[PDB]
Write a structure and sequence with these properties.
This protein is mainly alpha-helical. Helices cover about 60% and strands about 5% of the residues. It is built from 11 helices and 3 strands, in the order H-H-H-E-E-E-H-H-H-H-H-H-H-H. It has helices at about 10-20, 20-30, 35-45, 65-75, 85-90, 90-110, 115-130, 130-135, 145-150, 155-165, 170-185; strands at about 55, 60, 65. A 3-stranded antiparallel beta sheet has the order 1-2-3. Helix 7 (about 115-130) runs parallel beside helix 10. The longest helix has 17 residues, at about 90-110. It is globular, with a radius of gyration of 16 Å. The relative contact order is 0.16. The PDB classes it as lyase. The entry lists the keywords Lytic Transglycosylase, lyase. It forms a monomeric assembly.
Length: about 190
């Protein structure tokens, strides 16, 4: 039973830095059918808006994408050989484009059939964090049955499930941080 609100995450500054990229996020989210606010929240959480960011096994750039895994998954989807370069992933436009593509792959692939857009949003950030498989297997070894069980919950019950059952402490924490980020973005819309 993960203490996922501890310690408090102060989203104000990460979101202010992420919001500088919002034009790109709106362009890429437009193109890929992905919500720009979700893109921006992920930039805030991942890189804090730093396009030169690096973290876990050479995940790179604003959305901290790894070339050999996620990057490759995007290239495969686009019918391209190979995978993004480090330089490409440091480019804000390319990085946000590929992150939006990867989010779309998750939404339309392993997570297809989640009907409540808010539960889908939570399932997306948990899947971005630690993979869709770990999430789905907290429900069932069968994909369709897992999606069915997810579809029985609302967003609050979904978080509670993830907090009680997901093996990764990062999973419920990502939902907590996403909501901190979405709240902080409200200061930026008049």
């Amino acid at each position: 039973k993960h203490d996922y609100t501890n310690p408090p995450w102060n989203a104000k500054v990460p979101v202010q830095r992420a919001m500088q990229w919002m034009p790109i996020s709106q362009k890429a989210g437009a193109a890929w059918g992905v919500d720009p606010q979700l893109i921006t929240a992920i930039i805030a959480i991942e890189s804090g808006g730093n396009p030169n960011a690096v973290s876990k096994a050479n995940a790179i750039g604003l959305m901290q994408l790894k070339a050999s895994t996620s990057g490759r998954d995007v290239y495969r989807r686009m019918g391209w050989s190979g995978e993004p370069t480090t330089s490409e992933l440091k480019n804000p436009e390319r990085n946000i484009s590929m992150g939006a593509a990867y989010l779309n792959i998750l939404e339309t692939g392993p997570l297809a059939g989640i009907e409540d857009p808010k539960v889908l949003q939570y399932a997306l950030v948990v899947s971005y964090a630690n993979g869709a498989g770990a999430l789905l297997r907290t429900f069932s070894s069968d994909r369709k049955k897992a999606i069915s069980k997810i579809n029985d919950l609302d967003a609050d019950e979904f978080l509670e499930h993830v907090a009680r059952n997901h093996p990764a402490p990062q999973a419920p924490r990502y939902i907590y941080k996403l909501e901190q980020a979405l709240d902080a973005m409200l200061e930026h819309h008049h």
